[PDB]
Structure formats: structure tokens, C-alpha cells
Design an enzyme around this catalytic site. Structure first.
Site, mmCIF file in Angstrom:
data_model
loop_
_atom_site.group_PDB
_atom_site.id
_atom_site.type_symbol
_atom_site.label_atom_id
_atom_site.label_comp_id
_atom_site.label_asym_id
_atom_site.label_seq_id
_atom_site.Cartn_x
_atom_site.Cartn_y
_atom_site.Cartn_z
ATOM 1 N N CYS A 1 -9.344 7.888 63.351
ATOM 2 C CA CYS A 1 -9.080 9.004 62.972
ATOM 3 C C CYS A 1 -8.634 9.086 61.369
ATOM 4 O O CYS A 1 -8.499 10.093 61.075
ATOM 5 C CB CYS A 1 -9.277 10.189 63.227
ATOM 6 S SG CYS A 1 -10.738 9.243 64.725
ATOM 7 N N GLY A 2 -7.330 7.874 60.599
ATOM 8 C CA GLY A 2 -6.823 7.897 60.417
ATOM 9 C C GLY A 2 -7.189 8.569 58.340
ATOM 10 O O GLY A 2 -8.772 8.551 58.179
ATOM 11 N N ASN B 1 -6.153 -4.277 55.839
ATOM 12 C CA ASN B 1 -5.711 -4.639 55.375
ATOM 13 C C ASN B 1 -5.185 -6.154 56.390
ATOM 14 O O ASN B 1 -4.949 -5.661 57.645
ATOM 15 C CB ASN B 1 -5.121 -4.880 54.291
ATOM 16 C CG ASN B 1 -5.295 -4.166 53.188
ATOM 17 O OD1 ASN B 1 -6.592 -4.198 52.770
ATOM 18 N ND2 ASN B 1 -4.817 -2.620 52.551
ATOM 19 N N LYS C 1 -6.990 -11.528 49.123
ATOM 20 C CA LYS C 1 -6.326 -10.749 49.678
ATOM 21 C C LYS C 1 -4.949 -11.057 50.118
ATOM 22 O O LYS C 1 -4.465 -10.122 49.987
ATOM 23 C CB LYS C 1 -7.200 -9.516 49.426
ATOM 24 C CG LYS C 1 -8.508 -9.196 49.018
ATOM 25 C CD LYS C 1 -9.719 -8.101 49.004
ATOM 26 C CE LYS C 1 -10.202 -7.558 48.561
ATOM 27 N NZ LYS C 1 -11.375 -6.813 49.044
ATOM 28 N N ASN D 1 3.677 -6.977 48.571
ATOM 29 C CA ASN D 1 3.602 -5.501 49.684
ATOM 30 C C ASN D 1 5.289 -5.736 50.233
ATOM 31 O O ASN D 1 6.368 -4.830 50.160
ATOM 32 C CB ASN D 1 3.393 -5.362 50.802
ATOM 33 C CG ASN D 1 1.870 -3.931 50.781
ATOM 34 O OD1 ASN D 1 2.426 -3.025 49.433
ATOM 35 N ND2 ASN D 1 1.050 -4.385 51.635
ATOM 36 N N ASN E 1 4.974 -1.014 41.484
ATOM 37 C CA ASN E 1 4.792 -2.617 41.564
ATOM 38 C C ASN E 1 4.808 -3.189 40.479
ATOM 39 O O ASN E 1 4.604 -4.680 40.641
ATOM 40 C CB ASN E 1 3.289 -2.535 41.873
ATOM 41 C CG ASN E 1 2.456 -2.301 43.372
ATOM 42 O OD1 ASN E 1 3.239 -2.051 44.223
ATOM 43 N ND2 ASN E 1 1.537 -1.958 43.247
ATOM 44 N N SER F 1 1.895 -0.011 50.037
ATOM 45 C CA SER F 1 1.456 0.919 51.302
ATOM 46 C C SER F 1 3.310 0.093 52.250
ATOM 47 O O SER F 1 3.604 1.454 52.845
ATOM 48 C CB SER F 1 0.352 0.442 52.159
ATOM 49 O OG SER F 1 0.184 -0.676 52.347
ATOM 50 N N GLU G 1 2.568 -3.223 57.882
ATOM 51 C CA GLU G 1 1.453 -4.395 58.423
ATOM 52 C C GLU G 1 2.604 -5.978 58.708
ATOM 53 O O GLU G 1 1.677 -6.998 58.249
ATOM 54 C CB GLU G 1 0.765 -4.442 57.233
ATOM 55 C CG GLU G 1 0.306 -2.803 58.043
ATOM 56 C CD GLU G 1 -1.479 -2.898 57.367
ATOM 57 O OE1 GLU G 1 -1.417 -2.236 55.972
ATOM 58 O OE2 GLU G 1 -2.225 -2.679 58.251
HETATM 59 N N1 LIG Z 1 -6.401 3.990 53.833
HETATM 60 C C1 LIG Z 1 -6.983 3.508 52.096
HETATM 61 O O1 LIG Z 1 -6.636 3.749 50.695
HETATM 62 C C2 LIG Z 1 -6.846 1.894 52.318
HETATM 63 C C3 LIG Z 1 -7.948 1.046 51.732
HETATM 64 C C4 LIG Z 1 -8.045 -0.455 52.115
HETATM 65 C C5 LIG Z 1 -7.608 -0.810 53.231
HETATM 66 N N2 LIG Z 1 -6.600 -0.148 54.081
HETATM 67 C C6 LIG Z 1 -5.901 -0.905 54.973
HETATM 68 O O2 LIG Z 1 -6.782 -0.150 56.459
HETATM 69 C C7 LIG Z 1 -6.199 0.130 57.348
HETATM 70 C C8 LIG Z 1 -5.830 1.315 57.826
HETATM 71 O O3 LIG Z 1 -5.143 1.964 57.055
HETATM 72 P P1 LIG Z 1 -5.586 4.374 56.687
HETATM 73 O O4 LIG Z 1 -5.147 4.136 55.728
HETATM 74 O O5 LIG Z 1 -6.433 4.609 56.605
HETATM 75 O O6 LIG Z 1 -4.336 4.093 57.924
HETATM 76 P P2 LIG Z 1 -3.945 5.272 58.881
HETATM 77 O O7 LIG Z 1 -3.942 6.604 58.223
HETATM 78 O O8 LIG Z 1 -2.594 4.958 59.331
HETATM 79 O O9 LIG Z 1 -5.073 5.337 59.820
HETATM 80 C C9 LIG Z 1 -5.070 4.634 60.987
HETATM 81 C C10 LIG Z 1 -5.380 5.601 62.398
HETATM 82 O O10 LIG Z 1 -6.142 4.813 63.441
HETATM 83 C C11 LIG Z 1 -4.001 5.419 64.481
HETATM 84 N N3 LIG Z 1 -4.174 5.275 65.743
HETATM 85 C C12 LIG Z 1 -2.938 3.923 65.882
HETATM 86 N N4 LIG Z 1 -3.189 3.318 67.049
HETATM 87 C C13 LIG Z 1 -4.192 3.542 67.236
HETATM 88 C C14 LIG Z 1 -5.158 3.885 69.101
HETATM 89 N N5 LIG Z 1 -5.058 2.655 69.715
HETATM 90 N N6 LIG Z 1 -6.160 4.048 69.826
HETATM 91 C C15 LIG Z 1 -6.974 5.081 67.980
HETATM 92 N N7 LIG Z 1 -6.014 5.741 67.099
HETATM 93 C C16 LIG Z 1 -4.742 5.031 66.870
HETATM 94 C C17 LIG Z 1 -3.547 6.415 63.813
HETATM 95 O O11 LIG Z 1 -3.246 7.986 64.141
HETATM 96 P P3 LIG Z 1 -0.933 7.131 64.668
HETATM 97 O O12 LIG Z 1 -0.366 6.771 63.139
HETATM 98 O O13 LIG Z 1 -1.642 8.704 65.165
HETATM 99 O O14 LIG Z 1 -0.922 5.745 65.967
HETATM 100 C C18 LIG Z 1 -4.288 6.912 62.413
HETATM 101 O O15 LIG Z 1 -4.558 8.290 62.507
HETATM 102 C C19 LIG Z 1 -4.981 -0.060 57.257
HETATM 103 O O16 LIG Z 1 -4.659 -1.645 56.968
HETATM 104 C C20 LIG Z 1 -4.949 -0.884 55.647
HETATM 105 O O17 LIG Z 1 -4.129 -1.121 55.036
HETATM 106 C C21 LIG Z 1 -6.580 1.371 53.586
#
Ligand SMILES: NC(=O)c1ccc[n+]([C@@H]2O[C@H](COP(=O)([O-])OP(=O)(O)OC[C@H]3O[C@@H](n4cnc5c(N)ncnc54)[C@H](OP(=O)(O)O)[C@@H]3O)[C@@H](O)[C@H]2O)c1
Length: 293
Positions: free
Chosen positions: A8-9, A98, A176, A184, A194, A244, A256
Site C-alpha cells: 500500500c505504497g 522494477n 527495461k 540506477n 541521471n 530511485s 533493489e
Molecule cells: N512509484 C513509482 O512511480 C513506480 C513506477 C514504476 C515502477 N515502480 C516499481 O514498483 C515497485 C514498488 O514501488 P513503490 O514506489 O510503490 O514502492 P513503495 O512506496 O516502497 O511501496 C511498497 C509498499 O509495500 C510495503 N511492504 C514491504 N514489504 C511488505 C510485506 N511483506 N507486506 C506488505 N507490504 C509490504 C511498503 O511498506 P514499508 O516500506 O513499511 O515496508 C510500502 O508501503 C518498485 O519495484 C518500483 O521500482 C514504481
């Protein structure tokens, strides 16, 4: 459709918000269990969605039509395996992250397993997520056995435009990954945006030559030149950005890397290809992580 969103991030809150706006029944799933999750999202048009939704309801999980997974790569497979015996065996699991290497950790999942990438951008600002940019989400079969789940692309297109099914998702993930293997770790090591990477054409090409060799052995057609050109297009479009991985480094967070250059090294080892530059990047970043942690 009934969906459980694991993680839920920034991205999970984006999908949760978007799914609610179309009336899909949803819940969150958190690391530290709580009965509800906080969704606070600012859309590209400034509109605000602030909502408390169900979380960690196992009965809800057991009757979900989709498990949508938006965890960081190193979080994915242990968290999925732990829900898999609750989730119906026919319910698809869609991974959006990613990096690569999570599917190898999920070979015995009996559910249909789908992999996704997205160019949407969502950024945390305190306890608010901001939808910075719209974009494109591609999904396909994660493994050889995984069948035709294109119907999900058609549903999710109406939730967070544009979404498309791609049978050749893997080849797209490998391209990608090439870009990620350059941008990265170099930005993380050099502590630069970058665009500074354009002053290192030789090192960029070298990384691209190593990755192209792994990719060819994996059966996807590419070339070092093509990977290099795609790297430069991404650098050109993100010149002022902090990557990131550099954000992780500066915030003393785990990165990552085990699913970027680390994955590339595991596949290099399994085809007996030497990847000295990728190796240096991986080890340099692991050392930087050990300076905290
Ligand atoms: N955000 C973007 O713009 C974007 C775009 C394209 C791709 N991505 C990729 O999407 C993936 C997620 O990115 P994000 O930006 O959404 O990351 P984020 O904000 O860190 O979201 C991850 C969420 O999952 C939680 N988590 C960790 N372990 C868990 C578990 N066992 N059970 C449940 N929740 C857990 C985290 O909480 P805690 O931190 O409290 O552990 C956090 O709230 C990454 O690989 C990123 O590279 C992101």
C-alpha cells in the site's frame, strides 16, 4: 471485480484510488497487519482522494478475483508465497515492479502468474502520494505455463489508462532491466542526476555490451547499440531526476540491486558469461548499503 492490493505504497495507493473510482471492490494488504489502510492520493488534476479502506482481511483475500502486487522487488516473493494458500488457485496474481528475478522465486505458485511494468509515476510526499505522470502499463504471462489473461488488460484499461496485454512481456522486461542496470547503480555511486551519465559513454556501452550478451543467451533479440540508444532516451527524458536507487541510498534504505545488476549477474553466471562492469556496480552498491543497515 474484487481485488486485493498487496503493498500500500505509492503505486498500490495509485491502483487502489483508481480501482475505487470505477467501483471495484478492494482491500489493501500490509506488512505490519492493520485492519485498514490509508489511501491519500493527489491526482494529476489536483483532485484529492483520502480514504480508509479494508486491509488484511483473509476472507476477502480468499474470494478475490485478482491479487495485485505493488511491492518493491526484494519484498515480492516471500509476501506472495505467504498469501498463496489463501488465494483461490484460479485467481491470477499480477506483479508490478522494477527489476527481475521474482518469478524465479515463484516457480511453484499454482495460481496464474502475470508480470507487469508501468511508466506511471507516483511519488511519496510525507503521507500523501502524488500521481506525477500518467503512462502505460503492460502485462503478460510470467512463466511459460501462464495462459491468456488478456481480459485483465481490458478491465484495467478502464481503471488506469493505458493497459495492454503483451505475450512478449519478458523481452520487454529485459530491455527495461538493461536501462536499470546502467542508470540506477551509476547514479547511486556517483551521487548525481541521471543526465550526468551522458558524460560516460564508454562505461554505459560496456554495461550495455554485457547485458546484450545475457539477453541474447536468454533468446531475446537485441544489440548493445539498441540498448545504449534506449538508455540515452531514458536519460534524455529524465535528465534532472534523482533515480530511485539514488533516493534509496540517500535515505539509507535497502535498494533493489539484488533484482537489477544482481539478477543480471545470476543469469550471467548461469550462462558462464563474464560481466566485470556489472559486477563492479553490484559490489559497489552492496558496500554502500553496508555503510548503513
Ligand atoms: N512509484 C513509482 O512511480 C513506480 C513506477 C514504476 C515502477 N515502480 C516499481 O514498483 C515497485 C514498488 O514501488 P513503490 O514506489 O510503490 O514502492 P513503495 O512506496 O516502497 O511501496 C511498497 C509498499 O509495500 C510495503 N511492504 C514491504 N514489504 C511488505 C510485506 N511483506 N507486506 C506488505 N507490504 C509490504 C511498503 O511498506 P514499508 O516500506 O513499511 O515496508 C510500502 O508501503 C518498485 O519495484 C518500483 O521500482 C514504481
Amino acid at each position: 471485480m474484487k481485488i486485493t492490493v498487496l503493498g500500500c505504497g505509492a503505486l498500490g495507493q495509485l491502483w487502489l484510488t483508481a480501482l475505487c473510482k470505477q467501483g471495484h471492490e478492494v482491500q489493501g494488504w500490509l506488512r505490519v497487519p492493520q485492519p485498514y489502510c490509508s489511501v491519500n492520493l493527489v491526482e494529476t488534476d489536483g483532485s484529492i482522494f483520502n480514504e480508509s479502506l479494508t486491509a488484511n482481511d483473509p476472507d476477502f483475500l480468499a474470494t478475490s478475483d485478482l491479487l495485485l502486487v505493488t511491492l518493491k522487488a526484494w519484498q515480492v516473493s516471500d509476501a506472495v508465497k505467504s498469501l498463496a494458500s489463501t488465494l483461490p488457485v484460479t485467481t491470477p496474481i499480477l506483479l508490478i515492479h522494477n527489476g527481475m528475478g521474482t518469478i524465479e522465486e515463484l516457480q511453484n505458485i499454482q495460481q496464474p502468474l502475470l508480470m507487469g511494468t508501468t511508466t506511471h509515476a507516483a511519488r511519496r510526499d510525507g503521507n500523501v502520494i502524488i500521481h506525477v505522470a500518467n503512462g502505460i502499463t503492460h502485462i503478460g504471462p510470467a512463466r511459460q505455463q501462464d495462459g491468456d489473461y488478456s481480459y485483465l488488460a481490458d478491465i484495467l484499461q478502464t481503471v488506469l489508462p493505458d493497459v495492454a496485454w503483451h505475450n512478449n512481456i519478458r523481452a520487454e522486461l529485459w530491455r527495461k532491466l538493461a536501462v536499470n542496470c546502467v542508470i540506477n547503480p551509476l547514479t547511486a555511486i556517483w551521487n548525481c542526476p541521471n543526465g550526468e551519465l551522458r558524460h560516460h559513454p564508454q562505461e554505459i556501452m560496456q554495461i550495455c555490451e554485457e547485458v546484450a550478451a545475457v539477453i541474447e543467451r536468454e533468446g531475446h533479440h537485441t544489440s548493445a547499440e539498441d540498448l545504449r540508444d534506449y538508455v540515452m532516451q531514458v536519460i534524455d527524458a529524465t535528465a534532472e531526476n534523482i533515480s530511485s536507487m539514488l533516493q534509496d541510498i540517500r535515505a539509507l534504505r535497502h535498494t533493489e540491486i539484488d533484482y537489477i545488476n544482481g539478477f543480471l549477474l545470476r543469469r550471467a553466471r548461469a550462462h558462464g558469461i563474464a560481466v566485470p562492469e556489472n559486477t563492479r556496480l553490484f559490489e559497489m552498491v552492496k558496500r554502500k548499503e553496508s555503510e548503513y543497515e
